[PDB]
């Protein structure tokens, strides 16, 4: 009846999202973004985007802390609303989110109660192992971003998981969701 949105953080998160999405189609869902850009002919409001005809209203709502993530392109605003994520939460679907940890803090300030799982790399070498495709260049930036991000945002994670293989990481991610979904 109510399922908590999920944000996986750390290396390999996107693939954890993909494989969980790809493994339980019925359990996980996706939220619908907003856009102040005029809707296209073959675009569908409520499915491609909630199209805001009043751009002024969406700017004010962003300033009212109703979006967890936002940006501007070709003079148009795009964002994922606080309310659009709950709309998935009410269908009994877990909302898989590609959002920052600040965005996580904002879903908690809502009281939405989301599942924030952080994947801690053991070492730079662990980055190269748990991660299927990557070069040594990219691995350092990933290892250095994960270490700063835990030192800054530990207090907001529902769990921290580790593994020498991604399958071990992926299994513990499902263990977290399984313990905290009841």
């Amino acid at each position: 009846h109510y399922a908590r949105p999920i944000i996986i953080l750390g290396p390999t998160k996107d693939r954890a999202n993909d494989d969980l999405l790809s493994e339980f189609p019925d359990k996980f869902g996706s939220c619908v973004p907003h856009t102040t850009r005029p809707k296209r002919e073959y675009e569908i409001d409520g499915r491609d985007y909630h199209f805001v005809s009043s751009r002024e209203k969406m700017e004010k709502d962003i300033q009212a802390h109703k979006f967890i993530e936002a940006g501007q392109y070709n003079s148009h605003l795009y964002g994922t609303s606080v309310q659009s994520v709950r709309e998935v939460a009410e269908q009994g679907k877990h909302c898989i989110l590609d959002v920052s940890a600040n965005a996580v803090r904002r879903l908690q300030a809502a009281h939405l109660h989301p599942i924030a799982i952080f994947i801690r790399p053991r070492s730079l070498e662990n980055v190269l192992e748990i991660n299927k495709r990557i070069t040594e260049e990219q691995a350092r930036k990933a290892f250095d971003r994960a270490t700063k991000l835990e030192q800054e945002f530990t207090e907001c994670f529902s769990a921290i998981v580790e593994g020498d293989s991604f399958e071990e990481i992926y299994h513990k991610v499902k263990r977290v969701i399984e313990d905290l979904s009841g």
Binding site: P33, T35, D48, G71, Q72, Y78, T80, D98
Partner: peptide, 12 residues
Amino acid sequence: RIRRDEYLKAIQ
């Protein structure tokens, strides 16, 4: 993640 380039560019 949002499967639309426009949204991704906007958040960048």
